[PDB]
Amino acid sequence: KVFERCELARTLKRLGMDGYRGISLANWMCLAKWESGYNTRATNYNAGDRSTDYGIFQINSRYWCNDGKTPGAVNAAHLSCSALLQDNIADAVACAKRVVRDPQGIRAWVAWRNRCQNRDVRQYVQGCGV
């Protein structure tokens, strides 16, 4: 599914993402935006290391979900990567919460640092009623 901006914001709010481990909703919105364009079906194969990024948050198969074909992976979230491609984002949100429980927090995604860190991200939630 391709989410509309405010529809996603409200969904994230309801799933408890606002302020999770100190990360505002706007930050999560910024992240989904640059990672997938708010698309749950997005997949990106990394030829470099043979891992794949899955779903709306582009979560990597070497550490957080199992896809079976990734060399030397772990499944920290203990989830099939297939779960990150559903229309329903409950699993993907549970997974993103696990990722940020590590010391790097949101810094885990380089896209976040490139496109969202030290920026005015209010834009992503303006007018959504969150």
mmCIF file of C-alpha atoms in Angstrom:
data_model
loop_
_atom_site.group_PDB
_atom_site.id
_atom_site.type_symbol
_atom_site.label_atom_id
_atom_site.label_comp_id
_atom_site.label_asym_id
_atom_site.label_seq_id
_atom_site.Cartn_x
_atom_site.Cartn_y
_atom_site.Cartn_z
ATOM 1 C CA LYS A 1 0.000 0.000 0.000
ATOM 2 C CA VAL A 2 1.139 3.585 -0.673
ATOM 3 C CA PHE A 3 0.064 5.753 2.268
ATOM 4 C CA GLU A 4 -1.075 9.321 2.009
ATOM 5 C CA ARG A 5 0.964 11.546 4.349
ATOM 6 C CA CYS A 6 -1.635 12.396 7.013
ATOM 7 C CA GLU A 7 -3.143 8.908 6.929
ATOM 8 C CA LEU A 8 0.292 7.489 7.847
ATOM 9 C CA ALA A 9 0.894 10.137 10.544
ATOM 10 C CA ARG A 10 -2.340 9.229 12.333
ATOM 11 C CA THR A 11 -1.585 5.505 11.967
ATOM 12 C CA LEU A 12 1.874 5.957 13.545
ATOM 13 C CA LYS A 13 0.397 8.045 16.310
ATOM 14 C CA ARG A 14 -2.097 5.275 17.159
ATOM 15 C CA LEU A 15 0.728 2.653 17.144
ATOM 16 C CA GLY A 16 2.569 4.652 19.802
ATOM 17 C CA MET A 17 5.457 6.055 17.736
ATOM 18 C CA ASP A 18 5.267 9.670 18.932
ATOM 19 C CA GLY A 19 8.208 10.174 21.308
ATOM 20 C CA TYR A 20 9.237 6.485 21.239
ATOM 21 C CA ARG A 21 12.808 6.419 22.703
ATOM 22 C CA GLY A 22 12.768 10.198 22.324
ATOM 23 C CA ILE A 23 11.917 10.240 18.588
ATOM 24 C CA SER A 24 9.125 12.628 17.561
ATOM 25 C CA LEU A 25 6.477 11.559 15.057
ATOM 26 C CA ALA A 26 7.774 14.042 12.498
ATOM 27 C CA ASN A 27 11.145 12.205 12.584
ATOM 28 C CA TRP A 28 9.463 8.884 11.847
ATOM 29 C CA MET A 29 7.511 10.580 9.017
ATOM 30 C CA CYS A 30 10.764 12.023 7.621
ATOM 31 C CA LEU A 31 12.287 8.538 7.711
ATOM 32 C CA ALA A 32 9.409 6.723 5.892
ATOM 33 C CA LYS A 33 9.360 9.502 3.354
ATOM 34 C CA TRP A 34 13.006 9.172 2.265
ATOM 35 C CA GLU A 35 13.261 5.397 2.778
ATOM 36 C CA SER A 36 10.214 4.309 0.716
ATOM 37 C CA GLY A 37 7.943 7.155 -0.320
ATOM 38 C CA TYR A 38 5.444 5.712 2.265
ATOM 39 C CA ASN A 39 5.311 2.423 0.326
ATOM 40 C CA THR A 40 4.944 -0.832 2.254
ATOM 41 C CA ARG A 41 5.894 -2.918 -0.774
ATOM 42 C CA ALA A 42 9.305 -1.285 -1.272
ATOM 43 C CA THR A 43 12.287 -3.647 -1.462
ATOM 44 C CA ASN A 44 15.933 -2.739 -2.197
ATOM 45 C CA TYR A 45 18.552 -5.372 -2.824
ATOM 46 C CA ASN A 46 22.077 -4.384 -1.712
ATOM 47 C CA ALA A 47 24.308 -6.150 -4.273
ATOM 48 C CA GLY A 48 27.262 -5.101 -2.153
ATOM 49 C CA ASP A 49 26.610 -7.285 0.868
ATOM 50 C CA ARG A 50 23.725 -9.481 -0.366
ATOM 51 C CA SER A 51 21.192 -8.088 2.123
ATOM 52 C CA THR A 52 17.777 -6.610 1.324
ATOM 53 C CA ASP A 53 15.875 -3.628 2.782
ATOM 54 C CA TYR A 54 12.197 -4.259 3.371
ATOM 55 C CA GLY A 55 9.062 -2.179 3.532
ATOM 56 C CA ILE A 56 8.053 1.242 4.653
ATOM 57 C CA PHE A 57 11.070 1.707 6.954
ATOM 58 C CA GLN A 58 13.539 -0.191 4.685
ATOM 59 C CA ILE A 59 14.576 -2.573 7.524
ATOM 60 C CA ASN A 60 17.642 -4.695 6.748
ATOM 61 C CA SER A 61 17.659 -8.468 6.558
ATOM 62 C CA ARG A 62 21.193 -8.914 7.986
ATOM 63 C CA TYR A 63 20.049 -7.925 11.470
ATOM 64 C CA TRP A 64 16.344 -7.508 11.947
ATOM 65 C CA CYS A 65 14.179 -9.909 9.922
ATOM 66 C CA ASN A 66 14.896 -13.314 8.402
ATOM 67 C CA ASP A 67 14.745 -13.752 4.615
ATOM 68 C CA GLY A 68 16.885 -16.904 4.524
ATOM 69 C CA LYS A 69 19.058 -15.754 1.568
ATOM 70 C CA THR A 70 21.191 -13.173 3.489
ATOM 71 C CA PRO A 71 24.670 -14.385 4.359
ATOM 72 C CA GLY A 72 25.574 -14.162 8.062
ATOM 73 C CA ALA A 73 22.363 -12.600 9.171
ATOM 74 C CA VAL A 74 20.567 -12.383 12.458
ATOM 75 C CA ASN A 75 16.870 -11.863 13.127
ATOM 76 C CA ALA A 76 16.901 -9.531 16.171
ATOM 77 C CA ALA A 77 13.239 -8.777 15.657
ATOM 78 C CA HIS A 78 12.624 -12.538 15.158
ATOM 79 C CA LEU A 79 10.317 -11.955 12.216
ATOM 80 C CA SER A 80 10.051 -13.163 8.648
ATOM 81 C CA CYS A 81 10.978 -10.230 6.304
ATOM 82 C CA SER A 82 7.659 -11.060 4.564
ATOM 83 C CA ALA A 83 5.943 -9.445 7.522
ATOM 84 C CA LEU A 84 7.424 -6.087 6.501
ATOM 85 C CA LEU A 85 5.663 -6.119 3.140
ATOM 86 C CA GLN A 86 2.083 -6.240 4.444
ATOM 87 C CA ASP A 87 -0.429 -3.388 4.013
ATOM 88 C CA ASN A 88 -0.950 -3.484 7.802
ATOM 89 C CA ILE A 89 2.190 -1.848 9.347
ATOM 90 C CA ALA A 90 1.823 -3.167 12.915
ATOM 91 C CA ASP A 91 4.717 -5.602 12.420
ATOM 92 C CA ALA A 92 6.982 -3.083 10.683
ATOM 93 C CA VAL A 93 6.324 -0.638 13.564
ATOM 94 C CA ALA A 94 7.129 -3.281 16.195
ATOM 95 C CA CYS A 95 10.361 -3.935 14.220
ATOM 96 C CA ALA A 96 11.299 -0.260 13.903
ATOM 97 C CA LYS A 97 10.797 0.081 17.704
ATOM 98 C CA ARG A 98 13.273 -2.815 18.296
ATOM 99 C CA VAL A 99 15.829 -1.216 15.969
ATOM 100 C CA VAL A 100 15.850 2.102 17.933
ATOM 101 C CA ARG A 101 16.156 0.316 21.259
ATOM 102 C CA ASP A 102 19.871 -0.074 20.296
ATOM 103 C CA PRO A 103 22.217 2.817 21.252
ATOM 104 C CA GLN A 104 22.320 4.378 17.760
ATOM 105 C CA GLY A 105 18.550 5.023 17.959
ATOM 106 C CA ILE A 106 17.165 6.576 14.732
ATOM 107 C CA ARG A 107 20.799 7.152 13.593
ATOM 108 C CA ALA A 108 20.705 3.541 12.510
ATOM 109 C CA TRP A 109 19.262 4.664 9.122
ATOM 110 C CA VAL A 110 21.784 6.753 7.143
ATOM 111 C CA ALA A 111 18.935 8.320 5.172
ATOM 112 C CA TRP A 112 17.756 9.830 8.512
ATOM 113 C CA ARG A 113 21.098 11.510 9.056
ATOM 114 C CA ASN A 114 21.208 12.759 5.443
ATOM 115 C CA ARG A 115 17.685 13.989 5.050
ATOM 116 C CA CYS A 116 16.171 14.560 8.508
ATOM 117 C CA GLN A 117 18.815 15.298 11.216
ATOM 118 C CA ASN A 118 19.073 19.018 12.127
ATOM 119 C CA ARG A 119 16.310 19.920 9.741
ATOM 120 C CA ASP A 120 12.903 21.486 10.214
ATOM 121 C CA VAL A 121 10.773 18.282 9.869
ATOM 122 C CA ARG A 122 7.476 19.887 11.024
ATOM 123 C CA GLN A 123 6.464 19.826 7.365
ATOM 124 C CA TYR A 124 5.815 16.089 7.431
ATOM 125 C CA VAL A 125 2.985 16.342 10.053
ATOM 126 C CA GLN A 126 1.509 19.786 9.297
ATOM 127 C CA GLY A 127 -2.276 19.641 8.966
ATOM 128 C CA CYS A 128 -2.642 15.966 9.942
ATOM 129 C CA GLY A 129 -4.275 16.542 13.334
ATOM 130 C CA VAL A 130 -1.542 14.739 15.293
#
